[PDB]
Design a binder for this molecule. Structure first.
Ligand code: HEM
Length: 465
């Protein structure tokens, strides 16, 4: 491939990044922000300023990788450092995380990365026999509540009930603990939401006019002290509920305190936060797929469970081809966590489709994942949600290009990489969600809106089996 100069520039000091920030949040929105520049520069690799800049991030300047050939450099731990960049060009204060740098911020060259990731691997494996019954019990209650609400209001707000369900499910599945039986009661979603906002506000718009938002959430960090007591309520819940897992932490050589902050983060930030985005997005995209697709999913799921003597098991799920494909297609079409960063460890030659680009050691690389996973040079019908995309031998080959977990779907998370520790769990629970919907309902209708973190979604009809 020809070597090209990386196009783009950072504009004038102070004003360049602020203008780009306005485009990103207000005047274009993230997708058009990136696509307009792809068009202008005639390149899927270019220089751009990223939020938050201002007084929160020291350096907003990145090289953006916006195709499925260049993007995977972000996974290669020999090419990129993955230290302190979970949230990009700033890192939330460790005052928000008990004074610890939590697992997600650690590079694999840090020895505690291996210990803590092994801890989470153990958490997930030890949960294996609780996942199915706890999912089926908690989500059954959710759909009961949604039917109730639809009968009262003629629509049912999915997010407003499902956030509690997700936390109850995780507490029961991971820790054999019902939050209702603890001091947390039903308060966890509100607590976690506030704490997550204190972490992520520099990257979010919450609807308000730019005259309010810019000085209030985009210029300076919100003070961690204001969420400390909320965080302590969550901490005490995890300390008291995670007994069995804390024994394993002890064996792995991790302090009780460090283990507990990491369990809190993995459960609340990574898992519950990820589900908070994913599940409403699934309801939206599957809703939009239409009633014929719903009918085909119901037919498949019910027939398979019938063939399995009414017992839902891992092997039964493997028979549900359209179901597996639909879940993969949600993750391809709308990756829940869209921003991945890595800092070049050494000089690199990054290949795109039609040119290669040279980056110097120390440059911040950035990828907006949906542009890599909706890359029309990789996927046919790239901007179409195609339920059956991954069905069969040929379809399954394309899973190497589904990147939601910060690595190819065909690859396994390890202590040596920064791929999502919960990769298999997420795909499992996403499948369980679709299964629970269509074992109960023939089809459904939705109404949709925006949310600071993903979509807002109402059911307007739920057609019972
Ligand atoms: C839908 C839910 C989830 C989504 C969308 C998601 C997505 C991601 C992504 C995109 C990353 C890469 C972060 C980066 O370096 O930029 C990541 C990392 C990580 N995730 Fe997940 N995740 C989810 C659920 C979970 C679960 C269930 C666990 C439980 C173990 C988990 C634990 C982790 C950990 C520990 C890392 C950092 C890995 C490391 O340091 O090697 N996540 N996740």
């Amino acid at each position: 491939l020809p070597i090209r100069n990386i196009p783009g520039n950072y504009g004038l000091p102070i004003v360049g990044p602020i203008k780009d920030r306005w485009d990103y949040f207000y005047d274009q929105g993230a997708e058009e922000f990136f696509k307009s520049r792809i068009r202008k520069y005639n390149s899927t690799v270019y220089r751009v300023n990223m939020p938050p800049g201002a007084f929160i991030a020291e350096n907003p300047q990145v090289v953006a990788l916006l195709d499925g050939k260049s993007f995977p450099v972000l996974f290669d731990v020999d090419k990129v450092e993955k230290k302190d960049l979970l949230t990009g060009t700033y890192m939330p204060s460790t005052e928000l995380t008990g004074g610890y740098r939590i697992l997600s911020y650690l590079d694999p060259s840090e020895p505690k990365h291996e210990k803590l990731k092994n801890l989470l691997f153990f958490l997930l494996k030890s949960s294996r026999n609780r996942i199915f019954p706890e999912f089926q019990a908690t989500y059954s209650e959710l759909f009961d509540s949604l039917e109730k609400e639809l009968s009262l209001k003629g629509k049912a707000d999915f997010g407003g009930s499902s956030d509690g369900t997700a936390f109850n499910f995780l507490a029961r599945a991971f820790y054999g603990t019902n939050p209702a039986d603890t001091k947390l009661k039903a308060d966890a979603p509100g607590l976690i939401t506030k704490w997550v906002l204190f972490n992520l506000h520099p990257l979010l718009s919450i609807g308000l006019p730019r005259v309010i938002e810019e000085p209030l959430i985009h210029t300076f960090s919100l003070p961690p002290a204001l969420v400390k007591s909320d965080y302590q309520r969550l901490y005490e819940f995890f300390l008291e509920s995670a007994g069995e897992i804390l024994v394993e932490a002890d064996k792995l050589g991790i302090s009780r305190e460090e283990a507990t902050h990491n369990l809190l983060f993995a459960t609340c930030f990574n898992t519950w936060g990820g589900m908070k985005i994913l599940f409403p997005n699934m309801v939206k995209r599957i809703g939009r797929a239409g009633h014929q697709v719903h009918n085909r999913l119901a037919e498949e799921i019910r027939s398979v469970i019938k063939s399995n003597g009414g017992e839902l098991t891992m092997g039964a799920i493997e028979k549900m081809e359209l179901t597996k494909s639909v879940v993969y297609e949600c993750l391809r079409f709308e990756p829940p966590v869209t921003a991945q960063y890595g800092r070049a460890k050494k000089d690199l030659v990054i290949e795109s489709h039609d040119a290669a680009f040279k980056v110097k050691a120390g440059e911040m690389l950035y990828g907006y994942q949906p542009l890599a996973t909706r890359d029309p040079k990789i996927f046919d019908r790239a901007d179409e949600f195609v339920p059956e995309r991954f069905v069969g031998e040929e379809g399954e080959k394309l899973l190497r290009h589904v990147l939601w977990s910060n690595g190819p779907e065909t690859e396994t998370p390890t202590v040596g990489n920064k791929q999502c520790a919960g990769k298999d769990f997420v795909v499992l629970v996403a499948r369980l969600f679709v299964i629970e919907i269509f074992r109960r309902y023939d089809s459904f209708d939705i109404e949709v809106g925006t949310s600071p973190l993903g979509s807002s979604v109402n059911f307007s009809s739920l057609r019972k089996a």
